[PDB]
Amino acid sequence: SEYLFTSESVSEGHPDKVADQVSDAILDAILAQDPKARVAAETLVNTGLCVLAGEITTTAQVDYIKVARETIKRIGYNSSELGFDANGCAVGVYYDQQSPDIADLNQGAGDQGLMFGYACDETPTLMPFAIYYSHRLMQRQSELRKDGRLPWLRPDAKAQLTVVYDSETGKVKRIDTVVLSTQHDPAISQEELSKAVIEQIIKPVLPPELLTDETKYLINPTGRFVIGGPQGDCGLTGRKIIVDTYGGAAPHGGGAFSGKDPSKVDRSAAYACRYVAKNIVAAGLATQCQIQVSYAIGVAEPTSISIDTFGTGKISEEKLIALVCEHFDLRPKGIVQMLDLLRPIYGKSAAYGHFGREEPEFTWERTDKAASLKAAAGL
Ligand X SMILES: Nc1ncnc2c1ncn2[C@@H]1O[C@H](COP(=O)(O)O)[C@@H](O)[C@H]1O
- Cβ closest to Mg ion, residue 235 vs residue 356: 235
- Cβ closest to a second copy, residue 145 vs residue 260: 260
Residues that bind Mg ion (CB under 5 A): 16, 239
Which region, left, alpha or beta, applies to residue 44 given φ > 0 means left and ψ of -120 to 50 means alpha?
A: beta
Query: How many separate helices (H) and strands (E) can be counted in the chain?
Result: 8, 11
Closest CA to 225 of 268, 261, 194: 194
Give least dist CB 244 to Mg ion, A. 12
Q: Is 14 annotated as a binding residue?
A: yes
Q: Is 8 annotated as a binding residue?
A: no
Which of a second copy, ligand X, Mg ion, none has residue 100 at its interface (CB below 5 to 8 Å by kind)? Answer: a second copy
Q: Is 333 annotated as a binding residue?
A: no
Build a one-symbol-per-residue string for 53-72: x at contacts with a second copy by CB under 8 A, - elsewhere.
xxx-----------------
CB pairs under 8 A, 24+ apart, for 169-174? 172/122, 172/129, 172/210, 173/2, 173/210, 174/210, 174/211, 174/212, 174/214, 174/215
Assess 151 for contact with a second copy (CB under 8 A): no
- Cβ closest to Mg ion, residue 12 vs residue 16: 16
Assess 329 for contact with a second copy (CB under 8 A): no
Give least dist CB 291 to ligand X, A. 19
Give me the phi and psi of 292, to 5 degrees please: -120, 135
Which of Mg ion, a second copy, ligand X, none has residue 53 at its interface (CB below 5 to 8 Å by kind)? Answer: a second copy
- Cβ closest to a second copy, residue 108 vs residue 344: 108
Q: Is 38 annotated as a binding residue?
A: no
Pairing of strands 216-219, 172-184: parallel
Assess 12 for contact with a second copy (CB under 8 A): no
For 221, residues 6+ apart whose C-beta sits below 8 A from its C-beta are 179, 181
- Cβ closest to a second copy, residue 5 vs residue 275: 5
User: DSSP for 84-104?
Assistant: --GGG-EEEE-PBPPPTTT--
Binding site for L-methionine, residues?
Answer: 55, 98, 233, 264
